[PDB]
Design a protein around this ligand. Sequence first.
Ligand SMILES: Nc1ncnc2c1ncn2[C@@H]1O[C@H](COP(=O)(O)OP(=O)(O)OC[C@H]2O[C@@H](O)[C@H](O)[C@@H]2O)[C@@H](O)[C@H]1O
Ligand SMILES: [Zn+2]
Lengths: 26, 278
Amino acid sequence: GPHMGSQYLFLPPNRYIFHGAEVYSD
Amino acid sequence: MRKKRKDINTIEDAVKLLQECKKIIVLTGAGVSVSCGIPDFRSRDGIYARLAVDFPDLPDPQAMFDIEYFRKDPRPFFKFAKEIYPGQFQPSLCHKFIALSDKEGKLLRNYTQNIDTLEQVAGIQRIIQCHGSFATASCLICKYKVDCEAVRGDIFNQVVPRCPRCPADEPLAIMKPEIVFFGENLPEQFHRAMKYDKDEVDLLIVIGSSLKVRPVALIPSSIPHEVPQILINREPLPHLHFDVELLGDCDVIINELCHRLGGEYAKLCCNPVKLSEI
Ligand SMILES: Nc1ncnc2c1ncn2[C@@H]1O[C@H](COP(=O)(O)OP(=O)(O)OC[C@H]2O[C@@H](O)[C@H](O)[C@@H]2O)[C@@H](O)[C@H]1O
Ligand SMILES: [Zn+2]
């Protein structure tokens, strides 16, 4: 899988950011 | 408008919901097939962006799938149709995950907006093709219906297929594949299925859709408000209030969910190989 594909970034209380999220682009 | 449930927040909650719920609706869009090699509609490398380039004579890219424009001039669509015709792609992990849920009797329904028929290839049975498919074609004038094989040749030659019943000198007597265009009704199956499902669904999961197109986009607002809603998508959907938001590649996210679920769901992920005895 992708770099650190199993890890997420958590923005409480209910948002999880995984590899491929559009927020990483620009 | 539906407000978020305050007692459902975490990915752990999402997993528990998946373990306990027995009447799940999964609503899918073009996102679930991008990993298969099929671009979506509205992303930077999507269908609409490519149309703005390859068909600049259109008022806008959407005109390609607009019924009022199609009636004015169907030539662009048939020059382009073969590009979105179902090819030979393999189903993604997400399709396989939905198939397993159905196999285990937990899937109330998979409403898909896609026309790539990957749900069938994956063995999902309780499916609704919200936006039709290439499986059949229909005359714009007389409604004469034919199987896809009857117009396939014309499509792969970029020519407008003619109705064999209508007058040979009737310009609008052409065979439109039964994909739903803007300004057209969705198939009756969709409406009947939704009427049955809305009071039965105990969990909604939206995967790989921008939910910018109605009536499919209305599904989250048309079911009982207390029913939990989970989003699995690269981008948030600000016009809706989901309980849990899982943002990123759906295959990456589904993979993670499958591992927490265990059982057959974990086995769905066969790469890499897990520890097992020969
Ligand atoms: N690998 C992925 N994982 C998760 N989400 C993804 C992935 N790839 C794309 N997405 C997301 O899926 C969504 C797809 O949005 P659309 O391109 O607009 O596709 P869709 O929602 O299915 O389109 C609806 C309808 O619009 C009409 O033009 C057409 O008839 C289509 O069926 C976007 O929000 C995009 O970020
Ligand atoms: Zn006809």
